[PDB]
Each structure stands twice: as C-alpha cells, then as structure tokens.
Amino acid sequence: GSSGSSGFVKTVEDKYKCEKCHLVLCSPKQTECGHRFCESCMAALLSSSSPKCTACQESIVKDKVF
Ligand SMILES: [Zn+2]
Ligand SMILES: [Zn+2]
Numbered sequence: 001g002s003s004g005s006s007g008f009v010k011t012v013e014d015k016y017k018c019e020k021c022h023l024v025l026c027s028p029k030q031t032e033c034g035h036r037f038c039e040s041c042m043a044a045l046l047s048s049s050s051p052k053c054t055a056c057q058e059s060i061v062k063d064k065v066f
Contacts, residue, residue, distance in 0.1 A: 018042075019055040029065040033058035 016028040018038035028036035035055035037045065042060070045051040051060035 019053070029060075029062075031058060031060045032064050 015024050015026055016036045017024045018028065018041055019035040020037055020041035023038040025038055028038070029042045030036050031053050033053050033056055035053050045054065045060050046062060052058050053060055
C-alpha cells in the first residue's frame with residue numbers, strides 16, 4: 001500500500017531561456033509581457049531608454065522584472 005500518486009516526474013524538469021541569445025537560465029527576468037532574457041541582453045535593453053522586449057516589444061523594467 002505504498003506508491004507514488006502525483007505524476008511520475010522526479011526533480012524540476014523545466015527551465016527558461018533568453019529571448020535573444022537563447023541562453024538557458026533558471027531564474028530569468030520575465031518582463032511585463034511574458035518573454036524572458038539573460039542578465040546581459042536584459043541590462044542591454046533596459047539601457048535603451050525605452051526598453052520593450054526584443055521578443056515582441058512591450059516594456060522591460062528591472063522593478064517590474066522578476
Ligand atoms: Zn541573452
Ligand atoms: Zn515580449
């Protein structure tokens with residue numbers, strides 16, 4: 001009377017990737033649109049005055065980023 005029940009996947013099987021260099025990361029900076037970027041590319045866009053999102057282009061703000 002002992003056996004798994006919730007799915008059959010062990011350990012976290014998923015990650016993120018930058019929407020620029022496709023750099024696979026664990027904790028990206030999800031903007032206010034959804035897409036994600038890497039520390040680099042991220043710091044680059046934000047330093048563009050009007051950072052949107054290379055992906056679709058919406059808005060990239062460290063404060064609004066996670
Ligand atoms: Zn990148
Ligand atoms: Zn986007």
